[PDB]
Design a binder for this molecule. Sequence first.
Ligand SMILES: *[C@@H]1O[C@H](CO)[C@@H](O)[C@H](O)[C@H]1NC(C)=O
Ligand SMILES: *[C@@H]1O[C@H](CO)[C@@H](O)[C@H](O)[C@H]1NC(C)=O
Ligand SMILES: *[C@@H]1O[C@H](CO)[C@@H](O)[C@H](O)[C@H]1NC(C)=O
Ligand SMILES: *[C@@H]1O[C@H](CO)[C@@H](O)[C@H](O)[C@H]1NC(C)=O
Ligand SMILES: *[C@@H]1O[C@H](CO)[C@@H](O)[C@H](O)[C@H]1NC(C)=O
Ligand SMILES: *[C@@H]1O[C@H](CO)[C@@H](O)[C@H](O)[C@H]1NC(C)=O
Ligand SMILES: *[C@@H]1O[C@H](CO)[C@@H](O)[C@H](O)[C@H]1NC(C)=O
Lengths: 248, 596
Amino acid sequence: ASVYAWNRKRISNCVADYSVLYNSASFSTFKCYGVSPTKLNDLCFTNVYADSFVIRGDEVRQIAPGQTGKIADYNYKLPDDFTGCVIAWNSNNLDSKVGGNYNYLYRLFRKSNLKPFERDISTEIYQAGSTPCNGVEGFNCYFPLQSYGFQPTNGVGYQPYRVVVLSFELLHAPATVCGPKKSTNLVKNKCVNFNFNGLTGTGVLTESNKKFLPFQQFGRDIADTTDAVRDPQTLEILDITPCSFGGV
Amino acid sequence: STIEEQAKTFLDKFNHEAEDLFYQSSLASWNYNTNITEENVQNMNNAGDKWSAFLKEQSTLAQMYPLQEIQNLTVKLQLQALQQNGSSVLSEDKSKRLNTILNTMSTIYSTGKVCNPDNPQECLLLEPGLNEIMANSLDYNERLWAWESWRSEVGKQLRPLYEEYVVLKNEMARANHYEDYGDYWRGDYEVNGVDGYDYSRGQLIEDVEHTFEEIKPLYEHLHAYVRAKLMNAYPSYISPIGCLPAHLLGDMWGRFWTNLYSLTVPFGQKPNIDVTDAMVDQAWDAQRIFKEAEKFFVSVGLPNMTQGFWENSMLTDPGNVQKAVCHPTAWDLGKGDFRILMCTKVTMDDFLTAHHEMGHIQYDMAYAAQPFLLRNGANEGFHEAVGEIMSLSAATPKHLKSIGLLSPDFQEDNETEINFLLKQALTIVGTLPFTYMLEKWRWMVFKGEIPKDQWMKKWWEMKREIVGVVEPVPHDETYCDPASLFHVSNDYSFIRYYTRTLYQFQFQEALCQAAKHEGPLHKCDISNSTEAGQKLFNMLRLGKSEPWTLALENVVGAKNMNVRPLLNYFEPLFTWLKDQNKNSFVGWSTDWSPYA
Ligand SMILES: *[C@@H]1O[C@H](CO)[C@@H](O)[C@H](O)[C@H]1NC(C)=O
Ligand SMILES: *[C@@H]1O[C@H](CO)[C@@H](O)[C@H](O)[C@H]1NC(C)=O
Ligand SMILES: *[C@@H]1O[C@H](CO)[C@@H](O)[C@H](O)[C@H]1NC(C)=O
Ligand SMILES: *[C@@H]1O[C@H](CO)[C@@H](O)[C@H](O)[C@H]1NC(C)=O
Ligand SMILES: *[C@@H]1O[C@H](CO)[C@@H](O)[C@H](O)[C@H]1NC(C)=O
Ligand SMILES: *[C@@H]1O[C@H](CO)[C@@H](O)[C@H](O)[C@H]1NC(C)=O
Ligand SMILES: *[C@@H]1O[C@H](CO)[C@@H](O)[C@H](O)[C@H]1NC(C)=O
């Protein structure tokens, strides 16, 4: 979509992988603000609303927290210290054509600065003078709407880079989705610590003759003693019991 | 509800609308100059007419803004350039004489004819036929015929055409409430509205004329030196008591004396600074020529060229069927598209032209942060002199010996540098009086205080006085040989070449003081100094957004056009010329001796 008609789609109930972005070897503005790109994988907040729009190469600097300008003030304003990341890449091979790609529009004028995280969709014309315009172009109408023009011969500083904006904030909505956690390797016959999804403990593997039910994550036997778990990785049952101990 | 906020709204609308139309007109003009077909001519005139008509509509809308209350200078310069009516003041029956006459001038000049009268064997066009007979041959008889082969066969049919051009362009000044058309061209240098910084339109004629009384004594000694190695080849064949023929000064107009170097070499026993034989042993090509030029600039501190130029522009002469002209010109298509249009050759001139035409491209992106209406030079002399100061630096011996073109054992005595500096003086200093006289001639005839019967007797009497040339044949008033030049016929201001020299040496002294060079200006270098590169790019990037009279005060502190920091470059040359002319007859009076 265009800059003035940026969409906002929430990503939730599924795991979002940011590792593939690091080795994509295609982005040119892989910059993160307010958080390191690596450390936001394991931990993250909800409200993963993604904003997608088209920004010209020279207009990249305009789109940044605490930075004002033309696009940042009349099309989409990023709040200062915005906790998010911006990833941009060249789109000349697809978002360009000979003679100008007249498909992305933007707002050139506005009476007041845009509120951060606001989408402006209106046909209202700029009113700098006192006499309004009745639909006929004159000396004070100045139709703000204009069409971007991108060509394959555009300079590197003017190339249209396809960029998206990710927002991260913690609201009352629970059950946020973050990056996946790498699984360790199996270890057999050793008093080893284990930390499953929610619970952790120490013990060793020992043979058992009793099968556990398949619709429980963990179980206990006596005196709130958790001694049974069910790995969901492959549903392969493994027996875990506290390892031997005693006095000398 | 303020006029200040109303101008920024209008220029923001024009900048995005015009840059879409300008990129279509520049792209259409580029394909016409590379691939000529029958359909490509109709495609270019269709896009070019609606682009020219768009500026006609925007100039009328900006007219209703009053100019007496805009204290901001950035938008004042934009509104002054946008409100130039141009051809809109003329009526429809008079505006049709512009496009009709100007297209007739280009087609008439494009007719090549060297077939001999009463001897019709064959004749080819101008470029392969006319240029070889003036630049290579050394025979007096046919060149005297060749002098009359163009000023009596081409200029005779311009007398009714050029006079119609100079009687309607002169009328625009009364329609624009100016004095004359010569004063209209001085409006680009005119600055008003600033206290103590005002530049009158009429003060420039006096200041230019006041600076000409020190150019003359330099040109007196320059002409005296060059006359001693030419009278050697013709002792008793030309008399050494009068002036020189017009058809023996290198070119048709005698502007550049480069072709007299083979005839007038000072000391040909030692080899010249020539590396044409040096590049062919290592098999140098067009690609390796421009790569070492690029790494010279990035060592200074300027940004390198973008990736959308090497795979997009053309470098050599492509194909065999494409007979498109490749005159060295700089292309600014807009929207980040920049091209160089020339045919490369392994010659002296094309290697220097490769340096000359790339500098305009490097200047165009420098003021890329400026708005579109201010995306230009400060005046017409800035964009030409900036592209030539790096030509002086590339000619230095450390850079020629740095790449490996020159021999590793090349001594640097007295005579290897006096020969180079005086040859540069003939192509730079020698062209200053020719540039000043022609623009001085055009101003009074545009002013109108020259009758019809006094064109030739005043034009010829100053060529004999200032330049010092005796006419090889008398010419009456029906000839129109001053209108044959490229710039005068196509409405080009020739004053941008006089201010080119005075600008390209103001920057040299300013940058050498920034680099803290210990020595004179002839041995000074600009390279290997990132402090001077940031100093220049700070001054290159202003463009037309600031007045040019403020641009001088930002570097030298003198608001006028100073001539003193140009003689200091040639003090080693001037003191030798003063000693060499102790006995020669320096200074000519009026001379009717040969053709009384
Ligand atoms: C998830 O469980 C399925 C069940 O067979 C298994 O095939 C798959 O490999 C498991 N995922 C991983 C990452 O091992
Ligand atoms: C180049 O010119 C030739 C003839 O002059 C024409 O046939 C050809 O189509 C042109 N190429 C393009 C890309 O227009
Ligand atoms: C003057 O106009 C320029 C327009 O480029 C603007 O940037 C600057 O802020 C203005 N200054 C004042 C004092 O109005
Ligand atoms: C330009 O032309 C308009 C009418 O077309 C006129 O009102 C205006 O005064 C002219 N301006 C100049 C500077 O000649
Ligand atoms: C131009 O210079 C920049 C900065 O040193 C560099 O990253 C870039 O690769 C250079 N361009 C080329 C074509 O080498
Ligand atoms: C110095 O200049 C003179 C010219 O008068 C020349 O003869 C001499 O060779 C030069 N010096 C050297 C070392 O060549
Ligand atoms: C200037 O820079 C060039 C870079 O190639 C270097 O070769 C040369 O030695 C330098 N000269 C001086 C005097 O620093």
